[PDB]
Design an enzyme around this catalytic site. Structure first.
Site, short mmCIF file in Angstrom:
data_model
loop_
_atom_site.label_atom_id
_atom_site.label_comp_id
_atom_site.label_asym_id
_atom_site.label_seq_id
_atom_site.Cartn_x
_atom_site.Cartn_y
_atom_site.Cartn_z
CG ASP A 101 -1.81 1.19 1.19
OD1 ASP A 101 -1.65 2.19 0.39
OD2 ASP A 101 -3.08 1.04 2.18
CB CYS A 104 1.47 0.65 3.66
SG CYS A 104 2.46 -0.88 4.73
CB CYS A 107 4.41 -0.38 2.00
SG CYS A 107 3.04 -1.23 2.72
NE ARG A 131 -3.02 -1.98 7.02
CZ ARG A 131 -3.00 -2.18 8.31
NH1 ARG A 131 -3.74 -1.77 9.10
NH2 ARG A 131 -1.80 -2.95 8.67
#
Ligand SMILES: [Mg+2]
Lengths: 220, 214
Positions: A101, A104, A107, A131
């Site tokens: 994501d 994120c 991430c 998300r």
């Protein structure tokens, strides 16, 4: 082929009552139960459709439990390979598939370390798992990233903070999201190994390499 | 005997306390201290419970329905506050150090007044050997259990006592039913309502549930 499938029909009919209107029914290794893929997860359903239990299913015959639901889903996973954003390692020792994501936190950390993963022989392939939801800021942005001429460049740019240039595409991000949910993905980044094993949370390059070496040695 | 299941479980560090049939031919219901597992006869496959019967108008959790036998077997070590005109019976996993548990308890008359009988089992959130566990062990071992429970809840201390009760039994059953906190309200077919619910809300949900399960 010319063989009628009365019992799978009972399953579809049963799930329909539950609101589950879209299903993919396959065999399961447990006698009297089928694997049933839904948008919300994998269900094990008795042949007659009367009893349901949420996945996943484990085979505990060997030295470690293996999640057979996820092993089964590797087929669905590998079949999205041309929509994956792939950063291949020079001499590949391991391939991981990461549900990611662009908003994120870990991430971002993981992507920053892409060079280090690749240096260790680990190829990373991305699928999208927004998300916020199946229709929102990140989800639409990631569709644009995934539909770019150069997915690598697009992905790198968004993760760097350069924003995303729009595009339109065959790819439905929703396909990625459903596969993730089926695999038991409960948040990002979600690292899926070669037999479908989903790693608990984020591991950096060094720890991941160490873990991959052992996962490989102890799975057939 | 179920040797293969037990062998598989031992490999995993799992302790089975009961193995019995399931709605699925060739698959067993296996009660463990951490929950219910469904395991094939051959010891090879495992799915974590619960299982649902979806044949009727509304899904039923059959794992918990089965567990009601284990639950009702314990009726004599429950602390029961019966309703004068009993229309529903609920069983409540409680902890004397749990705030909403006191809120629930202090409304006992109002639940009773609506025709709801409340039966307690102990669920010391801090696990066994904890102070809550010990105090509740002593409470449950009193000769007048209701007197002991009211008094502890009212802050009048816990008289030490020993008896056959093993709180771990309550705790395990709770975990098997899917209890992940207190108070937890268990209906006549094992359906768990998590957290405190007021008398009027509880009475309403009970009436709906009874209509759905008949
Ligand atoms: Mg089968």
């Amino acid at each position: 082929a010319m063989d009628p499938e009365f019992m799978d029909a009972a399953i579809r009919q049963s799930l329909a009552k539950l609101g589950v209107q879209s299903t993919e029914i396959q065999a399961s290794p447990v006698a009297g139960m089928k694997t049933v893929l839904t948008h919300s997860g994998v269900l094990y359903v008795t042949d007659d459709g009367k009893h349901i239990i949420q996945g996943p299913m484990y085979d505990v015959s060997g030295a470690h439990p293996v999640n057979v639901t996820n092993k089964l889903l590797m087929s669905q996973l590998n079949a999205l390979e041309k929509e994956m954003i792939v950063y291949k390692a020079p001499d590949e020792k391991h391939v991981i598939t990461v549900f990611t994501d662009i908003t994120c936190g870990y991430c971002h950390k993981l992507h920053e370390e892409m060079k280090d993963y690749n240096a260790l022989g680990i190829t990373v392939r991305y699928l999208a798992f927004p998300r916020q939801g199946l229709e929102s800021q990140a989800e639409q942005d990631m569709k644009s990233i995934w539909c770019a001429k150069d997915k690598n460049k697009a992905f790198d740019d968004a993760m760097a903070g350069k924003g995303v240039k729009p595009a339109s595409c065959d790819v439905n991000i929703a396909d990625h999201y459903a596969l993730g949910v089926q695999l038991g993905v409960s948040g990002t980044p979600a690292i899926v190994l070669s037999n479908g094993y989903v790693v608990p949370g984020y591991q950096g390059p060094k720890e991941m390499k160490a873990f991959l070496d052992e996962h490989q040695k102890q799975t057939s």
